[PDB]
Amino acid sequence: MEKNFVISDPRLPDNPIIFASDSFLELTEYSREEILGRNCRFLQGPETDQATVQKIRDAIRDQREITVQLINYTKSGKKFWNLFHLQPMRDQKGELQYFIGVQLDGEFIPNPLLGLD
């Protein structure tokens, strides 16, 4: 099955991407070489709701799983709705090791209802 995902290392400065799936690269139109080491906020742009970005920032702080829908942009500037699922990954001793972020492309939640959040 097709899997859009990236893995970040929160033990390195500003939670850089250390792995991006082929499907993620195809969705976003970026090369692997040009996004390794980036914070995944590079997918955001003007239309991205900063209230939703705050919800992600809080979930990362608390190391809790969250799903949000927000506007992201391809390399060529095409807007897409991203239903984004964040999962903390802990080592055998319960210490945070990675985050994995899974992206589903689509306006799953209609914008008019999303706006009631």
Ligand SMILES: Cc1cc2nc3c(=O)[nH]c(=O)nc-3n(C[C@H](O)[C@H](O)[C@H](O)COP(=O)(O)O)c2cc1C
């Ligand atoms: C593993 C992982 C994957 C992420 N994937 C996305 C994404 O696909 N789209 C997006 O807008 N933000 C994504 N983010 C969120 C941003 O990297 C960042 O955490 C968010 O914008 C909140 O922090 P900031 O206020 O410092 O930007 C992801 C974060 C992590 C840790």
